Amino acid sequence: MADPRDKALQDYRKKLLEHKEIDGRLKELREQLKELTKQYEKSENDLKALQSVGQIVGEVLKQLTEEKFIVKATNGPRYVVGCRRQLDKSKLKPGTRVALDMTTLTIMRYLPREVDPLVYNMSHEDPGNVSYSEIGGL
């Protein structure tokens, strides 16, 4: 048969049909390994997410000393507590809402507050205008 221009040309087709066949399953299988890593990411986030032993929500009643305070639970008794190390204790003005440890029961972090729509009778703003012509005859 030697090389009579067709055993040449029939080869180039069957070699290139074989390469694109085997490159195809490579892209498909690599795409499947990319997908499971996204699933494995969510599993390792859940293994990280397994130590939220909670925090106790309370409010500062008054300041006793530089590192002693008086707090009270939202439905429970009163306590004498402290801060962690570097909590910037000047911001703990009496009346704020803080978060406490479960067992050590010391202060973790203060939190802002909005509750009780009786506050919406006296404290909110209304920076809304009318353009002096919606009302008339005065």
Partner: peptide
């Protein structure tokens, strides 16, 4: 060039496959 060459454009394509 795959039409007038008999082995350079084919045996290498046999080789590289």
């Amino acid at each position: 060039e795959e039409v007038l060459k008999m082995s350079t454009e084919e045996i290498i394509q046999r080789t590289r496959l």
